[PDB]
Short mmCIF file of C-alpha atoms and ligand atoms in Angstrom, two decimals:
data_model
loop_
_atom_site.label_atom_id
_atom_site.label_comp_id
_atom_site.label_asym_id
_atom_site.label_seq_id
_atom_site.Cartn_x
_atom_site.Cartn_y
_atom_site.Cartn_z
CA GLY G 1 73.26 108.71 96.63
CA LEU G 2 72.36 107.31 93.22
CA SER G 3 68.95 106.08 92.20
CA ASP G 4 68.37 102.45 91.16
CA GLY G 5 68.09 103.64 87.56
CA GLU G 6 71.41 105.47 87.91
CA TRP G 7 73.19 102.47 89.45
CA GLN G 8 71.88 100.34 86.56
CA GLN G 9 73.37 102.87 84.11
CA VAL G 10 76.68 102.80 86.00
CA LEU G 11 76.91 99.01 85.91
CA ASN G 12 75.80 98.92 82.26
CA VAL G 13 78.61 101.35 81.36
CA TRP G 14 80.96 99.22 83.44
CA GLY G 15 80.24 96.31 81.11
CA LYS G 16 82.37 98.15 78.55
CA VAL G 17 85.36 98.35 80.89
CA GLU G 18 84.94 94.67 81.78
CA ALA G 19 85.29 93.60 78.15
CA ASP G 20 88.84 95.02 78.16
CA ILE G 21 89.86 95.79 81.74
CA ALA G 22 93.60 96.04 81.03
CA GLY G 23 93.05 98.26 77.99
CA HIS G 24 90.73 100.64 79.80
CA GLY G 25 92.97 100.61 82.88
CA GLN G 26 96.06 101.35 80.84
CA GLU G 27 94.39 104.23 78.97
CA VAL G 28 93.04 105.65 82.24
CA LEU G 29 96.51 105.69 83.86
CA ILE G 30 98.13 107.04 80.68
CA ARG G 31 95.53 109.84 80.52
CA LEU G 32 96.26 110.60 84.20
CA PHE G 33 100.04 110.64 83.77
CA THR G 34 100.10 112.60 80.53
CA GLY G 35 97.58 115.20 81.69
CA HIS G 36 99.09 115.54 85.19
CA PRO G 37 102.82 114.56 85.24
CA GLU G 38 103.09 115.09 88.99
CA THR G 39 100.87 112.05 89.54
CA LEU G 40 103.60 109.93 87.95
CA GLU G 41 105.97 110.90 90.80
CA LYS G 42 103.73 109.16 93.31
CA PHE G 43 104.57 105.87 91.57
CA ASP G 44 108.17 104.85 92.33
CA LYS G 45 107.57 102.02 89.83
CA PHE G 46 106.40 104.20 86.91
CA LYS G 47 108.62 107.26 87.31
CA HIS G 48 111.09 105.66 84.88
CA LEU G 49 108.44 106.19 82.21
CA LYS G 50 109.61 109.22 80.29
CA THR G 51 107.37 109.10 77.21
CA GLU G 52 103.82 108.06 76.36
CA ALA G 53 105.34 105.37 74.12
CA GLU G 54 107.17 103.95 77.13
CA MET G 55 103.87 104.12 79.03
CA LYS G 56 101.85 102.33 76.34
CA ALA G 57 104.65 99.75 76.05
CA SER G 58 104.71 99.06 79.80
CA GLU G 59 103.18 95.70 80.71
CA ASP G 60 103.37 96.58 84.39
CA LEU G 61 101.38 99.78 83.84
CA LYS G 62 98.78 97.66 82.09
CA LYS G 63 98.95 95.30 85.09
CA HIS G 64 98.39 98.13 87.56
CA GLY G 65 95.60 99.42 85.34
CA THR G 66 93.87 96.09 85.83
CA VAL G 67 94.48 96.23 89.59
CA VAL G 68 93.10 99.79 89.83
CA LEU G 69 89.93 99.21 87.78
CA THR G 70 89.20 95.78 89.29
CA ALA G 71 89.21 97.46 92.71
CA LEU G 72 86.99 100.31 91.48
CA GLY G 73 84.72 97.80 89.78
CA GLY G 74 84.26 95.83 92.98
CA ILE G 75 83.36 99.05 94.79
CA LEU G 76 80.87 100.13 92.11
CA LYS G 77 79.15 96.72 92.22
CA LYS G 78 78.40 97.49 95.88
CA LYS G 79 76.24 100.41 94.73
CA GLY G 80 77.16 102.66 97.65
CA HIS G 81 77.47 99.97 100.35
CA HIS G 82 81.25 100.01 100.01
CA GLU G 83 82.63 100.98 103.45
CA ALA G 84 84.66 97.78 103.88
CA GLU G 85 86.10 97.99 100.35
CA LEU G 86 86.61 101.74 100.47
CA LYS G 87 88.12 102.29 103.93
CA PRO G 88 91.38 100.32 103.38
CA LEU G 89 91.88 101.95 99.96
CA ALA G 90 91.43 105.45 101.33
CA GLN G 91 93.83 104.67 104.15
CA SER G 92 96.63 103.17 102.04
CA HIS G 93 96.27 106.03 99.57
CA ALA G 94 96.48 108.65 102.30
CA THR G 95 98.98 106.99 104.62
CA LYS G 96 101.16 104.87 102.36
CA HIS G 97 100.87 106.42 98.89
CA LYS G 98 100.21 110.05 99.91
CA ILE G 99 97.68 110.60 97.11
CA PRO G 100 95.98 113.99 97.54
CA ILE G 101 92.22 113.95 96.87
CA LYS G 102 92.94 116.20 93.87
CA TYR G 103 94.56 113.25 92.09
CA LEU G 104 91.42 111.19 92.63
CA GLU G 105 89.55 114.03 90.94
CA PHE G 106 91.99 113.78 88.03
CA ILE G 107 91.54 110.02 87.65
CA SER G 108 87.75 110.35 87.80
CA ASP G 109 87.78 112.82 84.91
CA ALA G 110 90.27 110.52 83.16
CA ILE G 111 87.81 107.61 83.39
CA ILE G 112 85.11 109.79 81.82
CA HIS G 113 87.55 110.83 79.12
CA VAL G 114 88.55 107.23 78.32
CA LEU G 115 84.94 105.99 78.05
CA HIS G 116 84.14 108.67 75.44
CA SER G 117 87.42 108.03 73.63
CA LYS G 118 86.95 104.25 73.49
CA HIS G 119 83.18 104.39 72.96
CA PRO G 120 82.43 107.63 71.01
CA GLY G 121 78.73 108.13 70.48
CA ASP G 122 78.02 105.17 72.77
CA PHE G 123 78.35 106.83 76.19
CA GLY G 124 75.11 108.78 76.41
CA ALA G 125 74.32 111.86 78.42
CA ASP G 126 72.42 109.78 81.00
CA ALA G 127 75.30 107.30 81.19
CA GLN G 128 77.88 110.04 81.77
CA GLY G 129 75.64 111.57 84.43
CA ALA G 130 75.25 108.31 86.33
CA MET G 131 78.93 107.38 86.08
CA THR G 132 79.91 110.88 87.25
CA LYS G 133 77.67 110.58 90.31
CA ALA G 134 79.19 107.20 91.12
CA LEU G 135 82.72 108.59 90.81
CA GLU G 136 81.86 111.60 92.97
CA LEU G 137 80.40 109.28 95.62
CA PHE G 138 83.57 107.19 95.58
CA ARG G 139 85.72 110.31 95.74
CA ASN G 140 83.60 111.91 98.46
CA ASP G 141 83.67 108.87 100.70
CA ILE G 142 87.46 108.75 100.36
CA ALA G 143 87.62 112.48 101.16
CA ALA G 144 85.81 111.70 104.43
CA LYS G 145 88.45 109.13 105.36
CA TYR G 146 91.11 111.67 104.43
CA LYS G 147 89.65 114.30 106.79
CA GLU G 148 89.50 111.64 109.48
CA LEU G 149 93.25 111.09 109.08
CA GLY G 150 93.95 114.81 108.64
CA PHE G 151 95.59 114.02 105.32
CA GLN G 152 96.09 116.74 102.74
C1 HEM D 1 89.87 104.99 90.74
C2 HEM D 1 90.88 105.18 91.74
C3 HEM D 1 91.81 104.28 92.24
C4 HEM D 1 91.65 102.98 92.65
C5 HEM D 1 90.38 102.16 92.68
C6 HEM D 1 92.94 102.51 93.11
C7 HEM D 1 93.27 101.23 93.54
C8 HEM D 1 94.55 100.73 93.92
C9 HEM D 1 94.84 99.43 94.45
C10 HEM D 1 93.83 98.32 94.64
C11 HEM D 1 96.18 99.38 94.74
C12 HEM D 1 96.95 98.25 95.38
C13 HEM D 1 96.67 98.04 96.87
C14 HEM D 1 96.95 99.27 97.72
O1 HEM D 1 98.13 99.69 97.81
O2 HEM D 1 95.98 99.83 98.30
C15 HEM D 1 96.73 100.66 94.38
C16 HEM D 1 98.04 101.06 94.55
C17 HEM D 1 98.61 102.28 94.30
N1 HEM D 1 97.95 103.39 93.87
FE1 HEM D 1 95.91 103.53 93.61
N2 HEM D 1 93.88 103.53 93.00
C18 HEM D 1 93.22 104.62 92.48
C19 HEM D 1 93.82 105.86 92.21
C20 HEM D 1 95.14 106.27 92.38
C21 HEM D 1 95.69 107.52 91.96
C22 HEM D 1 94.92 108.68 91.35
C23 HEM D 1 97.02 107.52 92.21
C24 HEM D 1 97.85 108.60 91.86
C25 HEM D 1 99.22 108.61 92.05
C26 HEM D 1 97.32 106.22 92.84
C27 HEM D 1 98.54 105.69 93.29
C28 HEM D 1 98.86 104.41 93.78
C29 HEM D 1 100.15 103.92 94.18
C30 HEM D 1 101.44 104.70 94.33
C31 HEM D 1 100.01 102.61 94.47
C32 HEM D 1 101.11 101.61 94.75
C33 HEM D 1 101.69 101.08 93.46
C34 HEM D 1 102.75 100.04 93.69
O3 HEM D 1 102.42 98.84 93.82
O4 HEM D 1 103.93 100.42 93.75
N3 HEM D 1 96.15 105.50 92.90
N4 HEM D 1 95.74 101.45 93.89
#
């Protein structure tokens, strides 16, 4: 798991996201979609987005960005004790949305990318390390639920 010092770093870094949840959420999804176009296909409601301009201009994408990060934020605030919050998400993403674990890897890297892009020089080495650990924990616990379901 993460140490108390690491969880404190994670939640301190999260303060940035919380100041502009929709902005960070939007940029995270845009980074995901632009870097990995196949991920867009998993969203029947965003597949109509053909350009990054259309993406940035989408209020609904911004809306989903807020939904995605608010959920992740709630999980992070649990500092590891997130089974109840994590289980349903892993299950809807495996059973309903069919999101391979690889895409969760992509979005994790996208979150790291967005923090550096929006806060250059203000996302220290220790901060990136702690946030990475937290995102790997989140990803790994979902992977467990995926194996349980036999989802690939
Ligand atoms: C940090 C990771 C993520 C978090 C916390 C998260 C959270 C959520 C939440 C809370 C919902 C709505 C409730 C539900 O259906 O479970 C949702 C829906 C959805 N997510 Fe995720 N998600 C994440 C990553 C991804 C990724 C990488 C994809 C890639 C395709 C994805 C695709 C979807 C789809 C298709 C829906 C349904 C959208 C709709 O309403 O039509 N998610 N997500």
